C-alpha cells in the first residue's frame, strides 16, 4: 500500500504518557494530503461501545491504515490488549491555527490484526457527535 505520513502517536493513559512511532498508509489508488498534519498526534482510548450512534457519521469517512514501527514492543502489547478488549482511540491533531483534519478514530481488529483510522469528512459534526454521546 501507499505511505502517506509518518510521525508519533502519543498515547495518554490517564489512569502515564506512552509515545509510539507510526506510519499511515492509504490504498494504491487513494490520495490524501498530509503535509499540513503535525508530526505528533495525541490519543486517548475510549470504549468503542460509545461510537455506535455515531454510526452514520463514521460511515461518511476516509479509511486509513496505521502501522506501528515496533520501536518498543512493550508499549504496543499494552495497546493490542486494551484496544482488543473494546477500546478505540480518539486521535486529536494539535493545531494552534485551523486546518482540515482535527480528529480521527482508531479501531483495532484482533482477528485481522490491523489498525484502522477513520477520518470523518464532516470534522465538526463528528466532534459535536462525540460531545453529545458523552454529555449526560
Amino acid at each position: 500500500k501507499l505511505l502517506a505520513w509518518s510521525g508519533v502517536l502519543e498515547w495518554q493513559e490517564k489512569p502515564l504518557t506512552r509515545s509510539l512511532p507510526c506510519q499511515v498508509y492509504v490504498n494504491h489508488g487513494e490520495n490524501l494530503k498530509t503535509e499540513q498534519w503535525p508530526q505528533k498526534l495525541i490519543m486517548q482510548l475510549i470504549p468503542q461501545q460509545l461510537l455506535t450512534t455515531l454510526g452514520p457519521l463514521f460511515r461518511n469517512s476516509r479509511m486509513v491504515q496505521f502501522h506501528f514501527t515496533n520501536k518498543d514492543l512493550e508499549s504496543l502489547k499494552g495497546l493490542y490488549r486494551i484496544m482488543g478488549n473494546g477500546f478505540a482511540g480518539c486521535v486529536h491533531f494539535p493545531h494552534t491555527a485551523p486546518c482540515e483534519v482535527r480528529v480521527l478514530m482508531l479501531l483495532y481488529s484482533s482477528k485481522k490484526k490491523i489498525f484502522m483510522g477513520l477520518i470523518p469528512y464532516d470534522q465538526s459534526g463528528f466532534v459535536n457527535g462525540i460531545r453529545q454521546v458523552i454529555t449526560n
Binding site: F58, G86, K112
Partner: protein, 132 residues
C-alpha cells in the same frame, strides 16, 4: 474440550425487517456463564466492511472474558452499510452440537454499562483533548 454453540436471533431496533443471527461457540465449562451474560445484555454492532465488532453490554454481575468465545459468526439479512446498529434479542437457543463449520467473521467484546462518573471523566477528558 467439549464445544457448545449458541444462537442469538436479533432484529434491528429501528427496523424489524433487518435481522441478524449470532452464532457463538464456547467450552461447555462457561456455557452457563455466557448465557447469563447474554440474558442480561444489549447487543450493538459496528460494521466496517469485513470487520464486525459485536458489543455485548451486560448488567450481570460478572462480565465474561473475550477469550471464552472460541468462534463467532454474525450474519444479517439484508446486508448492511458500514455503521452502528442497536439490536433487540429476540431468541436465545442452545444447540451445543458444534458439528457445523463456522466462519469466525466477527469479534465479540463484552463490557458493563458505564457509570455516570466514568462517563463524566470521559466528558472532562475529551473536552480538554478536542477543545469543546
Amino acid at each position: 474440550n467439549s464445544l457448545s454453540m449458541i444462537k442469538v436471533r436479533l432484529q434491528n431496533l429501528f427496523d424489524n425487517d433487518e435481522v441478524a443471527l449470532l452464532k457463538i461457540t464456547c467450552y461447555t465449562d462457561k456455557l452457563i456463564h455466557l448465557t447469563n451474560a447474554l440474558a442480561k445484555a444489549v447487543i450493538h454492532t459496528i460494521k466496517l466492511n469485513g470487520i464486525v465488532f459485536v458489543h455485548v453490554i451486560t448488567s450481570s454481575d460478572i462480565c465474561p472474558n473475550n477469550n471464552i468465545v472460541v468462534k463467532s459468526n454474525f450474519t444479517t439479512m439484508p446486508v448492511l452499510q458500514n455503521g452502528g446498529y442497536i439490536w433487540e434479542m429476540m431468541e436465545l437457543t442452545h444447540c451445543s452440537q458444534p458439528n457445523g463449520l463456522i466462519d469466525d467473521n466477527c469479534e465479540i467484546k463484552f463490557s458493563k454499562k458505564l457509570s455516570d462518573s466514568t462517563m463524566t471523566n470521559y466528558m472532562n477528558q475529551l473536552s480538554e483533548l478536542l477543545g469543546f
